Design a binder for this molecule. Structure first.
Ligand SMILES: Cc1cc2nc3c(=O)[nH]c(=O)nc-3n(C[C@H](O)[C@H](O)[C@H](O)COP(=O)(O)OP(=O)(O)OC[C@H]3O[C@@H](n4cnc5c(N)ncnc54)[C@H](O)[C@@H]3O)c2cc1C
Length: 388
């Protein structure tokens, strides 16, 4: 799936090797966007980029710019490709060109770039690292097009879908999917070092295994002590370990299925939403004194690849005098507030209401129309109760 699979002007990279994206490809410049379909930032920025690549279809014109081709790597899947470039936070912009004497790459200082600045840059870079021909100029715009029109194929109906209704009940298969997705993808991208990260990871997984029994955390824990000097962490080995933990999610590893987190469209909600559910389920089901909020924050520190989001989250100040449950509830609501009016990159049919709504439970509100925390803390401990 990923973000650009409905857009022809952008080539989706499954691999680093450019010969196999086209014959001519290794001889042409590429502006590559690395992103994560779960990230607020990446979500929003994909607009711009699609728009930018949209301008790269011009047939016979003498713009140095028009010899470049736009491409995108999604780091929620293509973890291997991304690790190769030490990509961690996103989105991220790379200029690739042929090495004249596989490709040489150039890391963009600033990857958040307006459509023109993007153009102004790509242009500048092509001129700098290329010898700008006609023989070359037409050459690229050629394959550049065979890819465009060809990907246009891939994109009753091959479109027509239906009417959408948000599912508001909570289903384990969503919480589990979140856990699977986290271990399988997010842990994989970043690895187990340094030590502080491994620590974070162990503490989190252990806390999951204890709070949410038979979510298949046990299997994952085992995998986590398997790493040693002699058996160091590897994406291949690890992802294998996780699929065989028997985490009870729904769908295929490659494609997880959400229910409560299901959006009006595939590129909305999903993982980030499930991740929240899991975090709340943690606060409710924790054995006493594992710290939860302490642990959780520290997992988000080393495992959450959305940098805008991870940043102010690790700054929340959680005193463990009081109910983890309430506090995280507070925290998650503060976020909804922020994201409330934000139109860019959001699901049109699933708003950001302060949770729970009034229908959700009347018991939580009062005469005035504001929250009675004691009741809310009760409601959450029900809604998120984990029964196997
Ligand atoms: C820790 C964290 C920090 C994030 N920070 C940002 C950010 O800064 N910017 C950004 O764009 N995205 C951020 N995200 C992603 C974002 O929070 C949303 O999850 C996603 O962008 C859209 O969520 P949604 O509309 O599908 O429902 P979300 O609210 O995210 O999904 C949560 C689900 O859990 C329940 N829920 C909602 N609110 C509460 C609450 N108050 N208490 C208990 N349960 C609740 C509901 O069932 C809801 O459907 C963050 C995600 C996480 C996990």
């Amino acid at each position: 799936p990923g973000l650009f699979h409905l857009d022809s002007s952008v080539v989706d990279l499954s691999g680093d090797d450019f010969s196999r994206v086209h014959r001519v490809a290794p001889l042409c410049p590429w502006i590559v966007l690395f992103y994560n379909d779960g990230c607020g930032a990446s979500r929003r920025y994909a607009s711009t980029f699609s728009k930018f690549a949209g301008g790269l279809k011009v047939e016979h014109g003498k713009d140095a710019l028009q010899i470049a081709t736009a491409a995108a790597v999604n780091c929620a899947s293509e973890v291997d490709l991304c690790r190769k470039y030490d990509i961690n936070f996103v989105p991220r912009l790379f200029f690739f060109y042929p090495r004249d004497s596989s490709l040489e790459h150039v890391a963009f200082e600033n990857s958040h770039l307006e459509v023109d600045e993007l153009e102004s840059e790509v242009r500048r870079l092509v001129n700098k690292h290329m010898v700008v021909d006609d023989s070359l100029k037409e050459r690229c715009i050629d394959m550049h097009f065979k890819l465009y029109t060809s990907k246009e194929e891939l994109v009753s109906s091959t479109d027509e879908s239906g009417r959408f209704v948000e599912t508001t009940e909570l289903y384990a298969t969503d919480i589990a999917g979140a856990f699977f997705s986290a271990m399988h993808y997010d842990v994989s991208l970043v690895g187990t070092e340094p030590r502080e990260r491994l620590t974070a990871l162990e503490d989190f997984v252990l806390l999951v295994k204890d709070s949410l029994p038979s979510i298949g955390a046990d299997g994952v824990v085992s995998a986590l002590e398997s790493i040693t000097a002699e058996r160091p962490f590897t994406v291949a080995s690890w992802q294998d370990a996780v699929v065989k933990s028997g985490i009870p999610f729904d769908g295929s590893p490659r494609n997880v299925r959400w229910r409560t987190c299901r959006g009006s469209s595939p590129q909305y909600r999903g993982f980030p939403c499930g991740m929240w559910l899991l975090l709340h389920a943690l606060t409710v089901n924790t054995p006493a004194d594992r710290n939860v909020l302490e642990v959780i924050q520290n997992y988000i520190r080393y495992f959450f690849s959305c940098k805008e989001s991870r940043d102010h989250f690790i700054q929340f100040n959680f005193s463990p005098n009081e109910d983890p449950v309430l506090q995280l509830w507070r925290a998650h609501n503060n976020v909804n507030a922020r994201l409330a009016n934000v139109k860019d990159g959001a699901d049109p049919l699933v708003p950001k209401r302060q949770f729970p709504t009034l229908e959700a439970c009347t018991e939580c509100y009062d005469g005035a129309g504001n929250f009675i925390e004691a009741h809310v803390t009760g409601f959450l401990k029900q809604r998120y109760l984990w029964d196997p």
